[PDB]
Amino acid sequence: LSTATTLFWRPVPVHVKQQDREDVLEELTFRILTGVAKQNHNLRILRIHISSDSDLFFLHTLEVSEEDFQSLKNDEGILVDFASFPGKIISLLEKCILAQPGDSPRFQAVLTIRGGESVFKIVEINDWKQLPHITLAFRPGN
Amino acid sequence: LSTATTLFWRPVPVHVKQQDREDVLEELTFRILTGVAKQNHNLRILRIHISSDSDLFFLHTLEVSEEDFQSLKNDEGILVDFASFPGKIISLLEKCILAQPGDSPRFQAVLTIRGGESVFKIVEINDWKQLPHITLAFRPGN
After folding, report:
1. Do A128 and B78 make contact, defined as CB atoms within 8 angstroms?
2. Which among A78, A85, A129 is the nearest to B79, CB-wise?
3. Cis (ω within 30 of 0) for the bond into B140?
4. What is the Cα–Cα distance from B75 to A80, expressed in whole angstroms?
């Protein structure tokens, strides 16, 4: 990516779930970057990177190009354009940062890891269901 | 259904989506029943029927057995048992009934017809996303 601008770079409380392992609430670092892909006729790229200060090998990355976003928009029922999408993600992440144990409904950030792949979601838990506000697939590494 | 109890039987505002046609806000009649099917090992069944008082043939039907609910519960992240499920659906339908065009967020009933059959859902629409509280597939007719 060229002229890659970081829009968001903060720790986020995440419920890290994994096969055969205990769920753990960890402060993970999220970096959200936007840029244009020189090598791909200046396609705009949205990049989200998850890392852990305490584990150099804990790496998860999502890259959504403008063309990827057309499919994502349909599957997730997203109603805004590509340029407005990062800001909506940021607002959801803030709800997770600010969420308290007591309030209801409650916003949680969840990262389920499984076999060289993982699924990040932000859910709203009310009295009778877990409402996913966003669901994103991440790949291992940078 | 023999010992069948009707829990709900009234008009509800619904947004109908057809392939080669325009979206339309119609008053559709919803009937929700619970009972047992002698035809199916006396399993407990939830039956939902959609109709129209202006079109004799506009008919859509869903039947969910207590066995089917196990897979549905996981796909929809439902946190209550089968017995409590219809009440939550009814609660969602009431919100669609009481909703107003200028609300934010807005609860909205949607019936998408495709290839004959249809997909019904109740969404919570905010500034950027359709939050599906429930999604259900219906069959044409009674």
Report:
1. yes
2. A129
3. no
4. 26
